From a paper:
Protein kinase D is a serine-threonine kinase comprising two N-terminal C1 domains, a PH domain and a C-terminal kinase domain belonging to the Ca2+/calmodulin-dependent kinase (CAMK) family. PKD signaling is tightly controlled by the lipid second messenger diacylglycerol (DAG), which in cells is produced by phospholipase C (PLC) downstream of either GPCR or receptor tyrosine kinase signaling. DAG recruits PKD via its two C1 domains to specific membranes in the cell, such as the plasma membrane and the TGN, where PKD is reportedly active. A second requirement for PKD activation is the phosphorylation of two serine residues (Ser738 and Ser742 in human PKD1) in the activation loop of the kinase domain.
To determine the structure of this module, a construct comprising the N-terminal and C1a domain of the C. elegans PKD homolog DKF-1 was purified and crystallized. Crystals diffracted to 2.2 Å, and the structure could be solved by experimental single anomalous dispersion phasing using the anomalous scattering of the Zn2+ ions in the C1a domain. The crystal structure reveals a dimeric assembly of the protein, in which the dimer interface sits on a crystallographic axis. Dimerization is mediated by the N-terminal domain, which adopts a ubiquitin-like fold. The dimerization interface on the ULD is mostly composed of hydrophobic residues. Using the structure of the isolated ULD dimer (residues 12–98) and the PDBePISA server, an interface area of 751 Å2 and a solvation free energy (ΔG) of −5.4 kcal/mol were calculated for the dimerization interface. To validate the dimerization interface observed in the crystal structure, we mutated the central hydrophobic phenylalanine to a negatively charged glutamate (F59E), the rationale being that two negatively charged residues in the interface should repel each other. Indeed, the F59E mutation converted the ULD and ULD–C1a into exclusive monomers. Aside from ULD dimerization, the structure also revealed an intramolecular interaction between the ULD and its corresponding C1a domain. This interface, in combination with the dimerization interface, gives rise to a unique arrangement of the C1 domains, with their respective DAG binding sites pointing in almost exactly opposite directions and contains three highly conserved residues in the ULD, Arg17, Arg22, and Glu85, that form a contiguous surface on the domain outside of the dimer interface.
Residue numbers in the entry:
A (entry chain A), B (entry chain A): 12 to 149
């Protein structure tokens, strides 16, 4: 029973308890992830989840209740200068050993053509995942 | 009875009605401001207000009620690659003709030293304003 945090180009699993300070704790993991990149100021750090069935859309998390198990939460420093997205350019791909979707962390499933592969950063994603918000090609 | 919208390096006044679709309308002005910069996609556009007495902090707007008259709302495309802030480097300044705070739009008041002036972008701000979130030096 997890959630996934994402920042920079890094994902991390965090066990999802239902408990009053669940959100406090996710936030401090988030803060720790970002200082993992380098003392970036953190006062306007927010988590945004991807919408059910529509991963191009983000919703800000305000109460612990909006966190549902399995959700992908984005760590976003909202005070910080906007810059152009870098999208994966992607085409279908069949996989012969079990491989995981580089964005969401769950397994590509199916017989053939289990996901898409990006030509420039070589990642492996579900089609629904290859263009999720904040899945930038680094 | 206004609010201020900000995007890019531009501020705009919008009359604040209390009415069910007040937020709908601010959002579509916001969208129009951003396409003023160039067909940037807009599905993850959010407004954030600056906190009372603490302009370095932003809070996302979710219901029309969080909008209070006079507030400075930031227009933020949250799906979009983070980038380092560019802060004003600023020192006090006395003003001899009435001049407005370039960030918030209200007048510098006082007798001497009514605000601060930035050496590189030459702007005029209240001290509380010279380092508000998203008041980047362009
Ligand atoms: Zn890629
Ligand atoms: Zn996936
Ligand atoms: Zn400046
Ligand atoms: Zn001001």
């Amino acid at each position: 029973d997890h959630v996934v945090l994402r920042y920079g180009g890094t994902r991390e699993m965090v066990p999802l308890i239902r408990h009053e300070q669940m959100l406090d704790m996710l936030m401090e993991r988030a803060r720790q992830i970002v200082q993992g990149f380098g003392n970036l100021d953190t006062r306007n750090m927010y988590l945004f989840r991807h919408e059910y069935n529509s991963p191009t859309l983000l919703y800000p998390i305000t109460s612990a209740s909006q966190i549902t198990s399995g959700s992908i939460l984005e760590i976003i420093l909202v005070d910080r200068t906007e810059a152009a997205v870098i999208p994966h350019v992607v085409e279908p791909e069949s996989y012969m050993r079990p491989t995981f979707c580089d964005f969401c962390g769950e397994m590509l499933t199916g017989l053939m053509r289990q996901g898409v592969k990006c030509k420039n950063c070589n990642g492996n994603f579900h089609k629904r995942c290859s263009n999720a918000a904040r899945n930038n090609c680094g």
